[PDB]
Amino acid sequence: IDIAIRHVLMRQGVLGIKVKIMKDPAANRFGPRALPDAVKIAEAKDEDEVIPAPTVKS
Amino acid sequence: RKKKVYTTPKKIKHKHRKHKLAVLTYYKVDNEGNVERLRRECPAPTCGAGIFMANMKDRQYCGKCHLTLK
RNA sequence: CGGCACCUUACGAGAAAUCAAAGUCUUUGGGUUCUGGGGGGAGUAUGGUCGCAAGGCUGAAACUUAAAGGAAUUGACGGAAGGGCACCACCAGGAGUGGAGCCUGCGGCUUAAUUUGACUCAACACGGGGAAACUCACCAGGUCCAGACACAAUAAGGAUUGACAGAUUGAGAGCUCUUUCUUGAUUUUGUGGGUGGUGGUGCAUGGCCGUUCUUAGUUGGUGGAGUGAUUUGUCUGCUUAAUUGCGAUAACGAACGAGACCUUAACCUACUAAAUAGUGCUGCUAGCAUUUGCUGGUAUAGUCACUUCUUAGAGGGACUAUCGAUUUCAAGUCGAUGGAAGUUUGAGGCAAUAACAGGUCUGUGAUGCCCUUAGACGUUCUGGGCCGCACGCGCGCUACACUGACGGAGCCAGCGAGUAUAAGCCUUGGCCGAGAGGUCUGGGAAAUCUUGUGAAACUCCGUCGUGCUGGGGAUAGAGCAUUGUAAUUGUUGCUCUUCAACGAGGAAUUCCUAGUAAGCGCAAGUCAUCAGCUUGCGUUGAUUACGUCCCUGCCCUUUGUACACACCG
Ligand SMILES: [Mg+2]
Ligand SMILES: [Mg+2]
Ligand SMILES: [Mg+2]
Ligand SMILES: [Mg+2]
Ligand SMILES: [Mg+2]
Ligand SMILES: [Mg+2]
Ligand SMILES: [Mg+2]
Ligand SMILES: [Mg+2]
Ligand SMILES: [Mg+2]
Ligand SMILES: [Mg+2]
Ligand SMILES: [Mg+2]
Ligand SMILES: [Mg+2]
Ligand SMILES: [Mg+2]
Ligand SMILES: [Mg+2]
Ligand SMILES: [Mg+2]
Ligand SMILES: [Mg+2]
Ligand SMILES: [Mg+2]
Ligand SMILES: [Mg+2]
Ligand SMILES: [Mg+2]
Ligand SMILES: [Mg+2]
Ligand SMILES: [Mg+2]
Ligand SMILES: [Mg+2]
Ligand SMILES: [Mg+2]
Ligand SMILES: [Mg+2]
Ligand SMILES: [Mg+2]
Ligand SMILES: [Mg+2]
Ligand SMILES: [Mg+2]
Ligand SMILES: [Mg+2]
Ligand SMILES: [Mg+2]
Ligand SMILES: [Mg+2]
Ligand SMILES: [Mg+2]
Ligand SMILES: [Mg+2]
Ligand SMILES: [Mg+2]
Ligand SMILES: [Mg+2]
Ligand SMILES: [Mg+2]
Ligand SMILES: [Mg+2]
Ligand SMILES: [Mg+2]
Ligand SMILES: [Zn+2]
């Protein structure tokens, strides 16, 4: 998150503006690239077919 | 919160004392003659010729370099 | 068969609440009586009629008004009910505060002014507010323009500024007055326009902060309910620090907040190195026993070794791990064992949806408007005040003694800060001085020097002997130094003397669950000087729960509402 506050000089008083922008953590290039509680589980690599007991000589 | 009321009378700032053609009194021109330099121009190295004293009572003051004689 | 009713559903009705009739009503007609036509005026006036009367029945108008009203929704509130959490609530306790003196803040009183904001929590050692000058906004006085710019006036035959000497002044302010010199178109007067304000308005604002609340709360997608505003999800129960989880379930699956996260503390003989850290060896060297030993000093060349401690970067380690009980056998909880660590491992930082007439315009060259703007509410100089004292209150510091005072002796921390041509930083060591302090050199811009900050409680040995005593140290006198231009209304420090209440504190009331409370000091901030204050740090180190809703506050649910500017209605 980056923030910017400015005072706006109006004829009736002061207008205060705050612009809070949250950047996408995936694009962060220096700090962490995800939120602390973001857990990314890998996919199941299983469901292969197993053959009884050969030997493959290379 | 208070109204400033005065006790002493209002003062007036000093005004420059104008003197009409002061340079005439510093010199006495002689017919078929030359400058008089009658006011005893200051001899201090800061202010040379043309800077004159003030022939006031019991002292001679020049305004350029503030010094007095006799 | 007839009744008095009731339960479920909604085909159906209704604005809904609800209704087996309040259904068979825009798909409008079974029969029939009575009544209403926005709210008030008003069931009033008048007339009639009945009545003993009270009064009943019948019953207007003028005028006035934009709503009044019905049912339901969300919220707010309740001197309504039911749950829950919390040492800013209680229980068991500890230390207290409130009783004394003093420090300091507030009110009051006073004042020339005793500047001011804040008034339950969330005003009162708070504005980093420990004010000699400055600060400073107050008071009594004195200067300056630092009034830009377009004009107009004046103006070189000089628009104006500085000024010796005397008077004046608190002043060696030419401030002003006598005084004639000097300077030269920057500038003097009026107009506009400015500008500057610790002047007013925080109830006109920004920003910041505090508070509700660091409690646990908030929200949408799809689905369900409702004509709708809305509602469910977001809940009876159990559990947790927690809307956090188990579970129940017209909801399912999610987001913010919580938790995760980050900083810090505790472990690492496992890595990486260290002459700004330490150690063992080794040189050289000292003292004592002589046993070859034991304590030291020295070594930025002994041109040694190492990382145990020390420092810090890369990691590892804890996830309630394993085992017993209880439990919906779930979330969890309680016991053990192992472990450095088994209370969210300890402590913090960050911290949601909206919002408050919360506090500040006395932090801002942050600000709108109002006031003032040359005899200033601007700025500066001098002196005083903020300290002023019959009083009430709060944050604290010393004490009331022997679990102690003195007097010697022992002698252990951690967090930090530190300068130059300054305007003087931390300051050892030597020498003077009873002290405070002074003087001469050196080190340190710093893991190097101050500094092992040799701190205080604490421990040992003596005196004191229950006595307002050698407890306590106010109040006051005299003297000696330090800072500062300046110490008077004692800045502060030191010496001698003076020896006050207080002999454990009423009604009340605060903080707190483990390296915690309580003592005990030390550093940093303010700071020329001054710390009974804060922000931190370490030393010594407990008693008692590990529970509850009895008091108090807040949250939730139900409930009532004629409130919604929301009960300060
Ligand atoms: Mg219907
Ligand atoms: Mg029914
Ligand atoms: Mg019925
Ligand atoms: Mg009507
Ligand atoms: Mg109603
Ligand atoms: Mg609760
Ligand atoms: Mg108690
Ligand atoms: Mg005490
Ligand atoms: Mg007062
Ligand atoms: Mg006062
Ligand atoms: Mg004060
Ligand atoms: Mg000022
Ligand atoms: Mg002053
Ligand atoms: Mg004044
Ligand atoms: Mg306000
Ligand atoms: Mg829906
Ligand atoms: Mg619908
Ligand atoms: Mg709820
Ligand atoms: Mg809801
Ligand atoms: Mg629940
Ligand atoms: Mg090590
Ligand atoms: Mg163990
Ligand atoms: Mg924590
Ligand atoms: Mg207010
Ligand atoms: Mg306080
Ligand atoms: Mg002692
Ligand atoms: Mg030196
Ligand atoms: Mg140390
Ligand atoms: Mg004593
Ligand atoms: Mg005595
Ligand atoms: Mg002072
Ligand atoms: Mg200090
Ligand atoms: Mg203070
Ligand atoms: Mg508890
Ligand atoms: Mg209760
Ligand atoms: Mg209601
Ligand atoms: Mg209303
Ligand atoms: Zn001269």
Side-chain angles (χ1 to χ4, degrees):
Chain A
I1 296 170
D2 75 13
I3 299 169
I5 298 90
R6 281 85 170 93
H7 302 274
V8 177
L9 277 297
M10 292 296 173
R11 298 285 75 77
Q12 70 276 16
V14 176
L15 269 182
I17 63 170
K18 314 185 188 181
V19 178
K20 205 202 308 300
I21 290 179
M22 166 147 175
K23 75 178 179 190
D24 173 359
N28 188 2
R29 298 147 64 246
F30 290 72
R33 294 178 65 88
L35 281 72
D37 49 6
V39 178
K40 189 165 69 174
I41 302 299
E43 294 294 328
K45 197 72 151 53
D46 191 358
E47 290 86 5
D48 201 34
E49 182 65 26
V50 290
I51 60 172
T55 286
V56 169
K57 204 269 165 195
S58 294
Chain B
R1 281 82 65 193
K2 292 229 295 183
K3 183 56 217 64
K4 182 76 173 179
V5 64
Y6 304 99
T7 60
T8 61
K10 188 198 194 80
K11 277 203 190 160
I12 314 296
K13 277 200 203 204
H14 164 249
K15 182 69 176 178
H16 181 250
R17 169 98 52 77
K18 291 186 180 184
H19 183 254
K20 183 70 175 177
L21 282 73
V23 65
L24 292 188
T25 54
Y26 296 103
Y27 298 102
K28 182 265 290 180
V29 176
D30 170 34
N31 290 318
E32 323 300 328
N34 63 6
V35 57
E36 187 69 27
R37 306 286 202 80
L38 61 84
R39 183 67 66 193
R40 183 204 196 306
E41 65 184 2
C42 182
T46 75
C47 46
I51 296 90
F52 296 102
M53 295 296 172
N55 274 346
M56 64 185 74
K57 64 182 181 293
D58 68 0
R59 58 185 191 265
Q60 293 179 356
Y61 179 75
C62 64
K64 205 150 172 310
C65 63
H66 323 268
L67 61 84
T68 61
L69 322 174
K70 66 179 72 66

